[PDB]
Unconditional design. Sequence first.
Length: 607
Amino acid sequence: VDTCSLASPASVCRTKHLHLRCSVDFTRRTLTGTAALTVQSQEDNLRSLVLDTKDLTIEKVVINGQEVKYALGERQSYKGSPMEISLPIALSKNQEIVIEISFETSPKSSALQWLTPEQTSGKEHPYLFSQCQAIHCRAILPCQDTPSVKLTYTAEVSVPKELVALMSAIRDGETPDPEDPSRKIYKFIQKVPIPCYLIALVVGALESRQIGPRTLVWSEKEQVEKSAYEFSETESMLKIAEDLGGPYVWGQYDLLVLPPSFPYGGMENPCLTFVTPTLLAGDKSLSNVIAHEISHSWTGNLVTNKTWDHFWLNEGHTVYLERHICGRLFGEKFRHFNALGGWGELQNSVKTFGETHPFTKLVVDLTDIDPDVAYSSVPYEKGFALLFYLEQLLGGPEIFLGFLKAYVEKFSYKSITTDDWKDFLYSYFKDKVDVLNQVDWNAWLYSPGLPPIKPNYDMTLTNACIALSQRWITAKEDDLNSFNATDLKDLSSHQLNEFLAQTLQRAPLPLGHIKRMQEVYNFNAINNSEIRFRWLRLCIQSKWEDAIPLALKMATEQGRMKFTRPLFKDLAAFDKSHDQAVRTYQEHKASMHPVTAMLVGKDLKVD
Ligand SMILES: C[C@H](CS)C(=O)N1CCC[C@H]1C(=O)O
Ligand SMILES: [Yb+3]
Ligand SMILES: [Yb+3]
Ligand SMILES: [Yb+3]
Ligand SMILES: [Yb+3]
Ligand SMILES: [Yb+3]
Ligand SMILES: [Zn+2]
């Protein structure tokens, strides 16, 4: 049961292909065009079917050259409106037909953000980008909006000629629009079957630079050079990921650096990963987000969650490969460092949600829950924690890596549940069932709170972080003079980050300690977004008013939800900044990403 979709389920019928012809109207902020769905019946005598839509205007539905009848049901809030279509002939099992739907999106589409020129880098051209995961594809085009169905797709997209269109597919040529010489048509082909959440579109003043044999980076002109250097490890990480997961099947692996309002670190669109510009630290230090996006080329994009209830499958395996890529690159001690970090993140979200909250369960029941509201680090880190525990139980990384690659090969091109995964684990490790039977499955998969067991972590790189954070916590006023810029000389950027994460977990500290920290370590100068984030949270939670313009500025100048949401919540929890926080949210709202706007609104209780 896909409880997030209102469409006919895969048991009734399945989309096999989408042919999208559309046009991006910046003046109206709509996409207008036709989606031709090739639909296969999975039942005898099939006479109608249902698709998901959200805020779509339907002009007509044509099958076999004639218009047919359809109806739109009433709005079911965030699930949108079900669209029922009457087929002009009854279909037998496995018969196919092509349904061509003429449609137009709302300017308020939850899939889309429309940017004026002044909201971009170059200031001369507007920009558009999509984010379909989880259930926003329906807010672009009628479809069975469920990751239980995989289709191939072709598209032709008409844009103003001075702009560039890209999708989650291979570029298949461009020509002038023959109906409007002020527009170009860009063509695309996705030959590998994908869930519709993986359909993506960007349109903007984009340039490309090549950075490895099957990778171009794309961004506006002003970001190209910085991005090319920042993501230069991409091919070596692709090679390591092929070694762990088997052949990369997607042809190209290009990267697109989005504007600052992009809501996530990354989105694994096939052929074209989207990333936040907040990765551009200048030293490649945030490149684990590229390792993660690459790993999704296997776990998520080849083997996919059957419904969003089983999202941990996508994210937990991807974090598990991500941390192996970083470990082959930087050493096993560093993999442990990141894993132990991941645990503290899990501790953080459990504490923020409460230890009985349903959203701290690994497998979540999303009946009547908007997946955007349920989204957190839990499936990433509780999922990773489960895999890391099994790895240790089952005889170490080399052994558990053979399972990962077999699992990927078993379920390639399929959509699967937690039970499918577990069955295969039991079958793969048949000779270790007795070990597998010591696992508290009910607790790990279905209980809220921290898992019932904590893995074993090497401490080598973490100890210096803990040691410095503990010095600061236990320091009294007469001890502040002992801290010095030399305390940091042997810490990597990752260790500075993790010193601040440890210290943040015991926030607030006295305001005098925080001011000293700034005096001796000058964290205010650091532009690494992860480090800056945690330091500003430390400052605001410790009630340093000087930090208020700095936190508001970071919260609004980018819109990665990982940063924007905790900053606004911290700023709203501080009496001194409460009113500016609400006011700035309100003045920025209209020009925020729509999912980000909604979430920060809920977080702040505004509207
Ligand atoms: C690296 C992943 C890609 S699925 C991501 O963007 N995350 C993971 C949880 C937070 C959020 C973020 O970094 O903004
Ligand atoms: Yb029949
Ligand atoms: Yb007509
Ligand atoms: Yb071609
Ligand atoms: Yb079994
Ligand atoms: Yb003392
Ligand atoms: Zn991911």
